[PDB]
């Protein structure tokens, strides 16, 4: 699945 806009910020 694709991921949240912010799935990657600390």
């Amino acid at each position: 699945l694709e991921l949240d806009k912010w799935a990657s910020l600390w």
Partner: antibody
Amino acid sequence: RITLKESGPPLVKPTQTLTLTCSFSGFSLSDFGVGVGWIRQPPGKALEWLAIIYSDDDKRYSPSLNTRLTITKDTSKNQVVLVMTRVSPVDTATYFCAHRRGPTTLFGVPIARGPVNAMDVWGQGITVTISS
Amino acid sequence: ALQLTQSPSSLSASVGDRITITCRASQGVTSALAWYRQKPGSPPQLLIYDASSLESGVPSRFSGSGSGTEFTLTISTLRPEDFATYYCQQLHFYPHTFGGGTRVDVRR
């Protein structure tokens, strides 16, 4: 105090196009990372995520409803529109629009993801019924 | 897709008790879970964001916990208004999945 309010036709016929509007106050769609999302709820059932649009015109839709949903924004008029094409009696539900926070920004650059992980403020909801 | 499961699904309780609802994911969603309380004819209200963070305005009785795949909401002292349906939302993957709900009624 953030407030959102849904508006549109309470009655739509099948194969027609449903256009809902979300008018807000208390934030701007130009504030870093803010999002306005749509969630619906069939009478006496669960919440169902529909779509979301952000400050940067980045949009996402529910993969099931991908084909019919179109989400837009007018940053100036503080409004977000959701267009559901070719509706059927299964689309009869209460449609909510909600505000999503941007990340905790220090100097305009995000320092914390924390706050985005929830739709913090919702509107009263609008009941939409589909019938021929 | 994802699948985010709530257990109990329904629960009986009296004023004062303590209850814990469970939201479970098939994939790891890090800390991206939210908790809502829904009174009939009203929209969902935010209780817990980022799995454990209390939302400003939400009473201390509420509490969130967990990370990855196992999440829980813990109301400590049940109050009148707390008799409602509770939902959990996953905001890590698109689509932002919701739980099927966990209705909380008055026990007798």
